[PDB]
Swiss-Prot record, chain B:
Belongs to the WD repeat PRP19 family. Present with 11700 molecules/cell in log phase SD medium. The tetramer is an elongated particle consisting of four globular WD40 domains held together by a central stalk. Residues 54-126 are annotated as: Required for self-association. Its main location: nucleus. The gene is PRP19. Keywords: DNA damage, DNA repair, mRNA processing, mRNA splicing, Nucleus, Repeat, Spliceosome, Transferase, Ubl conjugation pathway, WD repeat. Residues 63-120 are annotated as: Interaction with CEF1. The chain holds residues 1 to 140 of 503 of the full protein. This is Pre-mRNA-processing factor 19. GO terms for molecular function: identical protein binding; ubiquitin protein ligase activity; ubiquitin-protein transferase activity. The keyword DNA damage applies.
Swiss-Prot record, chain C:
Present with 784 molecules/cell in log phase SD medium. Belongs to the CEF1 family. It is found in: Cytoplasm; Nucleus. Disulfide bonds: none annotated. It comes from the Eukaryota. Belongs to the NTC complex (or PRP19-associated complex), composed of at least CEF1, CLF1, ISY1, NTC20, SNT309, SYF1, SYF2, and PRP19. It comes from Saccharomyces cerevisiae (strain ATCC 204508 / S288c). The chain holds residues 482 to 539 of 590 of the full protein. This is Pre-mRNA-splicing factor CEF1. Involved in pre-mRNA splicing and cell cycle control. Required for the binding of the NTC complex (or PRP19-associated complex) components to the spliceosome to mediate conformational rearrangement or to stabilize the structure of the spliceosome after U4 snRNA dissociation, which leads to spliceosome maturation. Its absence leads to an arrest of the cell cycle, possibly due to the inefficient splicing of TUB1.
From Swiss-Prot, chain D:
Present with 721 molecules/cell in log phase SD medium. The gene is SNT309. This is Pre-mRNA-splicing factor SNT309. It comes from Saccharomyces cerevisiae (strain ATCC 204508 / S288c) (Baker's yeast). Involved in pre-mRNA splicing by stabilizing the NTC (or PRP19-associated complex). As a component of the NTC complex, associates to the spliceosome to mediate conformational rearrangement or to stabilize the structure of the spliceosome after U4 snRNA dissociation, which leads to spliceosome maturation. It is found in: Nucleus. Signal peptide: none annotated. It comes from the Eukaryota. Belongs to the NTC complex (or PRP19-associated complex), composed of at least CEF1, CLF1, ISY1, NTC20, SNT309, SYF1, SYF2, and PRP19.
């Protein structure tokens, strides 16, 4: 939840399609107009190369994390069984 | 199950610690004695670098394998929703234009029913 | 422009009416149960045929695979006594 | 506590029984049986496609 | 925040370069393996085209109950997927009833224009 | 830094019967292992 130029909370998170790193539209645009480049990797990048605005479309804004939680607790189960068996 | 250099079933498998891949000891040993390298990545490897506890295992069958199964279930069902979200956005878009052409046309049916009857009302009186 | 927005607004209104008619339901209940009885019939008959076809081929391979698993449980238990 | 007491926590014994001409509650329970039976019949299709090749490979 | 395929919060999101859309790595790959395309724009895209691009852990609350939660949540999602598909079939079905009336009406206008044409001839006489 | 498990022919059970057995087998083993 942070831009990779200033460090602010991005209200319009745009990303460069050369190095995966979410910037803010204002700062990245000022960097591109300064010199046509990506600020992190110094590769070629333009204004049209940037993907702007939020993405929610045909998606709708639980379940998946329950399975993640089930994994996380099992991860301990295995770690415990090891140290119990060693002894 | 296979050796990556020859393609046979290796009878003495030894895994390297630079390019992770199961090689046959007798094959990889000769590769190292030729030049100190790993055959796949061409990174340095010696014979001591190559390697052939107490917790007992059981074979991989249908807890962890069950959890990765339920990912396949949901991840497939999530794509099933896209097939109906995307198809809904075409039907509703064709319905919107269809009902608009219906609403734009029925005003003209109402006027022709007026005009054709008005022409019959006008002509018959004369 | 004006005709495009009036169609988009009406389409959202009908979409809300379609989501409202669906939320109230979840006469009609008897048809769904009979639709399932067709499915239960059609599907489970297919399932039983797929099962018994698989079972005939795979119960043999299960025994093959399951009797091999028992060999690990003895190959392990001897391993420890020899290490010990 | 589960191991000491010798009692496993009860799961959802609901989908199997159900009943026709029920109510709004069995309308849900019925609609559950359909989607899972379609998922079931799709889950048996991709198994039979490969068939015994996937089993003997393991 | 949301991958535009499933609706999850992506744990390894990847963005397509043909259309500006952050997908999840698992889901976009399956689609490309089915047909080499982008799910939103239907533009020719591949797996190498993708550029790999908040994590806050759910602390449910203060285990046998968590078994029945996961049961209920799968039970709910099964019906939330079912309800959304019968609605798609009936919106297409009611759309097809409109198309018949649309084309049936424009045949009824042809006869009404003839009655107007017949009237305009009689008025002139 | 592939394994194949043949998902049973009777594969409801994954939610109810299979998952139940897994957390039974985890529970009664470690308890018995603590006893050992």
């Amino acid at each position: 939840m942070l831009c990779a130029i200033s460090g602010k909370v991005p209200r319009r998170p745009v990303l460069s399609p050369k190095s995966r790193t979410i910037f803010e539209k204002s700062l990245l645009e000022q960097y591109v107009k300064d010199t046509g480049n990506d600020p992190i990797t110094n590769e070629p990048l333009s204004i049209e190369e940037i993907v702007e605005i939020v993405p929610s479309a045909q998606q709708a804004s639980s379940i998946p994390n329950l399975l993640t939680s089930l994994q996380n607790e099992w991860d301990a189960i295995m770690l415990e069984n090891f140290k119990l068996r060693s002894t | 199950m296979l050796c990556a250099i020859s393609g046979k079933v290796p009878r003495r498998p030894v895994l390297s610690p630079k390019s992770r891949t199961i090689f046959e000891k007798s094959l990889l040993e000769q590769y190292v004695k030729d030049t100190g390298n790993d055959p796949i990545t061409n990174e340095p490897l010696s014979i001591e670098e190559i390697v052939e506890s107490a917790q007992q295992a059981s074979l991989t069958e249908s807890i962890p394998n069950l959890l990765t199964s339920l990912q396949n279930e949901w991840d497939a069902i999530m794509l099933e929703n896209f097939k109906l979200r995307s198809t809904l956005d075409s039907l509703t878009k064709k319905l919107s234009t269809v009902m608009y052409e219906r609403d734009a046309a029925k005003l003209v049916a109402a006027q022709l029913l007026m005009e054709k009857n008005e022409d019959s009302k006008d002509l018959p009186k004369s | 422009x004006x005709x495009x927005x009036x169609x988009x607004x009406x389409x959202x209104x009908x979409x809300x009416x379609x989501x409202x008619x669906x939320x109230x339901x979840x006469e009609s209940r008897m048809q769904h149960i009979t639709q399932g009885r067709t499915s239960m019939k059609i599907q489970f008959k297919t399932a039983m045929p797929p099962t018994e076809v698989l079972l005939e081929s795979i119960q043999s391979k299960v025994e093959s695979i399951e009797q091999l698993q028992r060999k690990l449980q003895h190959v392990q238990p001897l391993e420890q006594q020899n290490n010990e | 506590a589960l191991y000491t007491e010798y009692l496993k926590q009860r799961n959802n014994k609901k989908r199997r029984t159900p009943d026709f001409n029920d109510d709004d509650d069995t309308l849900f329970l019925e609609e559950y049986r359909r989607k899972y039976p379609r998922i079931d019949t799709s889950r048996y299709i991709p198994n039979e496609s490969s068939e015994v090749s996937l089993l003997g490979i393991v």
